[PDB]
Amino acid sequence: AGVIDAYMTLADFCDQQLRKEEEAYPALVVEKMLKALKLNSNEARLKFPRLLQIIERYPEETLSLMTKEISSVPCWQFISWISHMVALLDKDQAVAVQHSVEEITDNYPQAIVYPFIISSESTSTGHKNKEFVARIKSKLDQGGVIQDFINALDQLSNPELLFKDWSNDVRAENKKNIEKMYERMYAALGDPKAPGLGAFRRKFIQTFGKEFDKHFGKGSDFNDITNMLLLKMNKDSKPPGNLKECSPWMSDFKVEFLRNELEIPGQYDGRGKPLPEYHVRIAGFDERVTVMASLRRPKRIIIRGHDEREHPFLVKGGEDLRQDQRVEQLFQVMNGILAQDSACSQRALQLRTYSVVPMTSRLGLIEWLENTVTLKDLLLNTMSQEEKAAYLSDPRAPPCEYKDWLDVGAYMLMYKGANRTETVTSFRKRESKVPADLLKRAFVRMSTSPEAFLALRSHFASSHALICISHWILGIGDRHLNNFMVAMETGGVIGIDFGHAFGSATQFLPVPELMPFRLTRQFINLMLPMKETGLMYSIMVHALRAFGLLTNTMDVFVKEPSFDWKWYPRQKICYAKRKLAGANPAVITCDELLLGHEKAPAFRDYVAVARGSKDHNIRAQEPESGLSEETQVKCLMDQATDPNILGRTWEGWEPWM
């Protein structure tokens, strides 16, 4: 009760002072936060990453009094920081937390195995850690079943994507790791038989990989030639049958006495509580899989549950999934901050998200609700058939901007030649080309009761505002309408495509994609009296003045090596913390564009349109070096959202839509 209160007061006083110190005491305070952690407290549960940076910051005292954690707290906690823990064990660091995770896996190994796999990459002191993790994997019994699931999951992957990734890797790369890569490529595809029971992949490998390895005497131009050779082959991906005869468990082999019982991957989030170990397990399957070519031709898989509750999911190829996990826990900690905020709870402000599960770099698992719809098809079905036919026939963004471009190559030249006159010209062209009221049609047709209509619409607007500003803080590039996904049972929408963060996509994409959030004329005309200075303005203000502990917890050790190339990430972390402390978003965009785009031409045009195309727009000198809430959000609305898009915009961004 009040003991926790005094705990929190002295805790945040002390660590705020310690943070202020730099631009004995740590040991006593961290032992105090542990004896606070005795009693369950989610807000205190939030400061674990800060505990790690203070462990590494002052090991001489923190690691000295480390011993009072196993001897102090055995509560099955730390679930959302398991990746952080197991990355900590990789180096000469805390080691009794290995005993803590020993206790955790003694409770159950569910959702510990995947962190172990993602940490399998990983002497004077590190050999001790190697012994500890060897003991861990010794405790990790029946892992071959899990690798059998891995084989089942990647037996449906098209080998063309694997070969293309291998080609990118060899382009990045003499035989020190090139031969290792060749061996891995061989064991993946060029091996005479796939260990799985496939037929699609097996026939493809037996037809092409042997020939390609014959071409490859080893084990640039040759890689390119092989690239053309294996892209000019059959462009068709369909693993054997709708039923996965390729996959042993998707075919047969239920869990017997000999086979261990495996849980549905990812449903546990504890706080030292004994998690209920009677939930849905991996049992049953309904195999009619749909193939959609979105980024790597992913497939929405349908999986029957143990408790006769089917749980559909999505299979995924490469594009490793530690960053999506990280931004997920960022979402939950933001939600916890909202919950503990009295005013946010007064408005009942809350965001909900989903579960995404990583296995390897070449293996990630994504859920699906199937009771939700994206914006594209929603707007299209709200639009009448004749209306959509008239739109698709003559006028679209290319029919509206062919002159504003003049094909590819032609966009840079009038991007350079951009001006306020053509800015307003293109704005008028797009606003005349696209109709309106479609959102209102959609809401009035989906809702029946009028007051319920108002309630759902207001809730949707608030949720959209909060999620858009959250992912703006996270620097997420949510380009198209498919970046959003709304469920027609509570009017809540969830973001999609978290593969772009902190403006890294803006940095490396040729065309820039700078904007605060996904805004269009429909969100403008959401209701006619709205001037966008009311509801979402208040929501943004309330979210922003809620601070600043996110700096310690956004990153832990390295934040996913590779990532981009596949520079210095702590630069991105410091830009994010500068945004949190208060910076001009135009300045933020400028410093983001200071990588690559400065070598690129039209850089002065980019920084000018970021600063503001209007004399009245170029006034924001208050948000830089100190946040002032309303000024910052009105800056993002005025000199960052509308006119830059009205001047220059990406065709796939769908600004008119």
Side-chain angles (χ1 to χ4, degrees), residues 1-60 62-97 99-287 289 291 293-299 301-325 327-378 380-381 383-412 414-553 555-558 560-561 565 568-635 637-640 642-657:
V3 192
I4 317 168
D5 291 331
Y7 278 145
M8 295 298 102
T9 61
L10 187 54
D12 63 358
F13 158 74
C14 285
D15 63 358
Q16 169 265 347
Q17 289 301 285
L18 287 150
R19 176 57 252 167
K20 197 247 167 185
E21 281 179 353
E22 69 277 337
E23 278 61 50
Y25 197 71
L28 68 93
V29 307
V30 299
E31 274 305 315
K32 174 167 171 289
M33 283 74 75
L34 260 69
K35 76 178 53 68
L37 184 63
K38 299 289 94 176
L39 308 182
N40 202 325
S41 160
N42 290 318
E43 54 278 358
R45 189 168 53 91
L46 294 174
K47 273 80 71 175
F48 292 166
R50 181 58 258 185
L51 294 174
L52 282 71
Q53 292 93 23
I54 209 64
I55 287 289
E56 58 87 18
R57 179 66 183 276
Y58 310 121
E60 62 277 359
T62 53
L63 276 186
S64 78
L65 288 182
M66 171 295 308
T67 74
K68 301 289 96 175
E69 62 92 13
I70 283 300
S71 47
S72 87
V73 62
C75 309
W76 282 322
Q77 296 180 355
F78 294 99
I79 297 89
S80 73
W81 307 268
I82 178 163
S83 58
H84 314 153
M85 295 298 102
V86 65
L88 183 63
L89 270 297
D90 181 28
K91 301 290 108 179
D92 53 356
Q93 313 299 137
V95 292
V97 294
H99 179 221
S100 81
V101 77
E102 275 168 357
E103 310 147 353
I104 284 153
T105 197
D106 290 348
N107 182 17
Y108 54 84
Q110 318 309 104
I112 295 90
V113 290
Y114 291 153
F116 189 86
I117 299 316
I118 208 67
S119 66
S120 48
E121 306 85 295
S122 288
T123 77
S124 68
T125 42
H127 73 302
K128 306 178 183 69
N129 301 108
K130 300 320 162 274
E131 303 141 13
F132 306 150
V133 302
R135 168 190 52 204
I136 291 309
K137 73 178 54 51
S138 77
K139 299 184 50 178
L140 292 196
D141 63 358
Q142 65 100 28
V145 184
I146 294 92
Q147 286 103 30
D148 164 81
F149 293 105
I150 287 150
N151 303 323
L153 294 174
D154 63 358
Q155 194 56 254
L156 61 83
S157 45
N158 46 354
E160 330 299 326
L161 288 183
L162 281 83
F163 162 73
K164 261 58 195 176
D165 302 352
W166 283 126
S167 67
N168 308 140
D169 301 328
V170 66
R171 270 153 189 144
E173 301 160 79
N174 275 90
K175 297 297 200 131
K176 290 167 286 296
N177 69 317
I178 295 89
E179 191 62 35
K180 166 65 167 36
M181 182 180 72
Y182 190 87
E183 289 144 3
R184 299 271 61 71
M185 183 278 288
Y186 206 93
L189 303 177
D191 47 345
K193 64 94 176 179
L197 323 172
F200 202 58
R201 280 184 95 197
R202 283 184 69 99
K203 73 168 158 277
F204 283 171
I205 62 151
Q206 83 198 1
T207 45
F208 314 123
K210 285 87 186 151
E211 198 188 358
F212 271 106
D213 282 303
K214 286 191 286 292
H215 308 147
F216 267 83
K218 291 188 197 172
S220 68
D221 48 352
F222 180 42
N223 313 122
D224 305 329
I225 288 153
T226 48
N227 273 115
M228 282 74 75
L229 287 158
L230 193 59
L231 62 83
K232 74 169 50 71
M233 60 79 71
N234 181 22
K235 316 190 156 311
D236 171 72
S237 197
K238 185 49 200 72
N242 277 318
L243 173 62
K244 302 291 96 175
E245 308 97 27
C246 51
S247 165
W249 157 233
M250 294 298 102
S251 315
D252 46 346
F253 185 32
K254 306 276 146 181
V255 174
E256 286 99 13
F257 294 148
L258 60 87
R259 204 199 208 177
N260 197 21
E261 284 70 26
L262 272 298
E263 199 192 5
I264 288 304
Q267 48 189 355
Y268 281 160
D269 167 42
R271 296 95 187 156
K273 63 182 181 180
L275 277 297
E277 293 321 295
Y278 46 78
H279 290 129
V280 54
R281 309 291 182 253
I282 297 177
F285 52 85
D286 314 316
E287 287 303 313
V289 56
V291 187
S294 297
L295 182 63
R296 291 301 199 111
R297 215 169 160 179
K299 274 84 71 176
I301 193 66
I302 283 175
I303 290 308
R304 188 49 167 194
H306 187 193
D307 303 333
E308 312 319 299
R309 309 287 96 80
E310 196 278 311
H311 305 314
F313 274 86
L314 280 72
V315 65
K316 192 268 296 179
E319 51 272 7
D320 181 46
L321 289 197
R322 282 192 264 145
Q323 66 281 4
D324 63 343
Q325 304 322 112
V327 65
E328 184 67 32
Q329 293 84 19
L330 294 174
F331 292 166
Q332 287 90 21
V333 298
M334 201 45 257
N335 208 352
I337 290 305
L338 294 174
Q340 56 83 48
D341 181 277
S342 68
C344 293
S345 48
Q346 280 318 115
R347 272 86 64 188
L349 294 174
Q350 184 270 351
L351 73 164
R352 83 288 178 275
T353 48
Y354 63 96
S355 88
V356 59
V357 164
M359 283 73 74
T360 63
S361 89
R362 203 58 178 168
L363 214 56
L365 183 62
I366 298 90
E367 67 94 28
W368 214 236
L369 175 69
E370 272 90 359
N371 190 359
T372 177
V373 65
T374 190
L375 294 174
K376 272 185 189 54
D377 47 5
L378 183 63
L380 268 294
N381 59 62
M383 199 172 191
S384 86
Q385 301 325 106
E386 55 276 14
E387 216 194 338
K388 78 189 60 180
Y391 170 69
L392 277 296
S393 65
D394 184 74
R396 283 92 60 203
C400 201
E401 310 308 312
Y402 280 151
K403 178 64 178 66
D404 208 9
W405 303 327
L406 274 303
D407 74 317
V408 291
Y411 39 81
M412 293 297 102
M414 314 159 73
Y415 283 162
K416 296 178 178 66
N419 49 78
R420 199 187 301 180
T421 294
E422 64 86 25
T423 293
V424 63
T425 315
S426 56
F427 153 71
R428 297 187 316 272
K429 292 189 287 184
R430 66 192 82 180
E431 76 181 324
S432 43
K433 185 257 291 184
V434 68
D437 186 74
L438 301 152
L439 280 193
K440 269 68 60 180
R441 299 165 222 193
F443 292 104
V444 302
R445 75 191 55 202
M446 61 79 71
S447 171
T448 52
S449 169
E451 289 277 351
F453 168 81
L454 284 174
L456 62 83
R457 175 181 170 275
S458 66
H459 181 74
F460 181 76
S462 56
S463 52
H464 186 273
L466 61 83
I467 62 170
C468 79
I469 64 178
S470 67
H471 81 72
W472 181 65
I473 293 295
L474 277 296
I476 305 308
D478 292 320
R479 200 213 55 180
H480 42 60
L481 281 75
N482 291 340
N483 294 97
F484 293 98
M485 185 64 72
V486 54
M488 72 292 291
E489 47 264 28
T490 192
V493 59
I494 181 70
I496 307 297
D497 182 33
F498 307 96
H500 310 299
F502 292 164
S504 52
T506 306
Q507 177 209 7
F508 282 180
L509 264 292
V511 56
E513 53 266 29
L514 73 165
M515 73 291 291
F517 83 102
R518 172 65 184 164
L519 178 56
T520 188
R521 304 164 77 253
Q522 282 311 120
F523 293 100
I524 297 169
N525 57 60
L526 81 172
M527 62 81 71
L528 183 145
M530 187 66 204
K531 297 199 324 290
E532 276 69 26
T533 67
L535 277 296
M536 81 305 297
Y537 201 96
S538 61
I539 295 317
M540 294 183 286
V541 159
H542 302 133
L544 183 62
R545 85 290 183 275
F547 328 100
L549 59 91
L550 274 300
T551 71
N552 68 85
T553 177
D555 192 4
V556 291
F557 294 100
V558 64
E560 184 57 39
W565 280 289
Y568 185 65
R570 273 80 74 191
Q571 288 304 322
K572 289 87 188 170
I573 296 89
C574 77
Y575 307 149
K577 82 170 47 62
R578 285 155 66 256
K579 286 177 66 178
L580 163 67
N584 172 31
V587 171
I588 298 295
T589 61
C590 286
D591 63 60
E592 181 268 345
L593 292 173
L594 294 174
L595 300 104
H597 311 267
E598 71 288 9
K599 277 82 71 176
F603 188 57
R604 72 279 189 190
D605 315 328
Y606 306 148
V607 307
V609 302
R611 180 68 183 89
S613 67
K614 321 273 159 61
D615 47 353
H616 42 277
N617 280 35
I618 48 172
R619 78 282 190 191
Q621 289 74 242
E622 62 282 12
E624 53 196 9
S625 72
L627 78 175
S628 187
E629 271 60 33
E630 52 274 358
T631 62
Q632 301 213 309
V633 296
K634 75 167 56 60
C635 172
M637 295 299 102
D638 189 359
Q639 73 173 18
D642 314 335
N644 48 359
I645 294 316
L646 309 184
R648 48 182 76 232
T649 182
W650 170 237
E651 53 92 15
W653 163 260
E654 319 288 301
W656 76 103
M657 278 300 165

